[PDB]
Amino acid sequence: MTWRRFDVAYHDPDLDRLILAARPLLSESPGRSWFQRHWVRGPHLELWFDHPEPSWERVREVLGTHLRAHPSRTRIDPDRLLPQHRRLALAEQIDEPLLPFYDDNTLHRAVPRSRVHVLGSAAAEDLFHDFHAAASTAAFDQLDAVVAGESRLGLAFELMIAAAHAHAEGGITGGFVSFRSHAEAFLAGAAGLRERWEAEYRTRAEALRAQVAAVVTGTPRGRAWTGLLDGFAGRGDELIASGALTVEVLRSPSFRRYRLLLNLTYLQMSRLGVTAVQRSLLCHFAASAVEEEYGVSAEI
């Protein structure tokens, strides 16, 4: 299909109220629509629509109003960032303008990027767009909770646990291995940062174990997330089997389906504002909590 992309430049990492101000635009008219946080040309919110409404004028009305009342006041440095962005663009296989960085608190029309070269096919891209549409709607409710005082990280941790228990072969004591792998890949040998993470785990060990257990047993939020994931599991299996969806035990359909659904969960955490370091921390915590709660070792 034929997408429109709008970039809302907002340099403050806290996007929650901006995203909630955008909610009517993503909720009022026919068509798929979704949002994500992105870095290119500086921190910004992206709004994606496959149908003609909301118009550019309507987007400007709703968001221009917000931005005049509640502007970002975080300063950045487009010359300390540009190097890192050129590297990241190579890594993420992005091919689009990197400069100039957007002025803070401005709206821009932008070119929708294709991800077919990464995902493997137009059918794979459409699956991810369909996920982003459903999950964006879910994210507004999750951000409402955060704005009201609930823990962002706690909510993200719940999605992760629920995803593993519902969608990994063997449940949580199968799927936690991916959490330890993710945390160690991020640490890249950092013994000192690992020690810090392990001390932060130990301080919270019973509380984390209790949350794992609560999610495994079933929570309305966990069940709602895994229900959303269930709508993609069969399509994911089909596209993995046909080769239309590129993959990253390794030959196992169940493993590859879990890895897809877990990666969708990570994309949701990003939508919620959980940074890469924080996601990795949560992975460390989840793996440790699972090991202690169930008497297992990522020995498997």
Cα(298)–Cα(232) distance, integer angstroms: 27
Q: Cα 135–141–147 angle (5° rounding)?
A: 130
Cα(30)–Cα(42) distance, integer angstroms: 30
Side chain identity at residue 186, one-letter code:
F
Strand order of the sheet with strand 44-49?
33-38, 44-49, 4-9, 107-110
Side chain identity at residue 221, one-letter code:
R
DSSP H or E run through 116: helix 116-119
Q: What do you get for the CA distance between the two ends of the chain, in Å?
A: 44
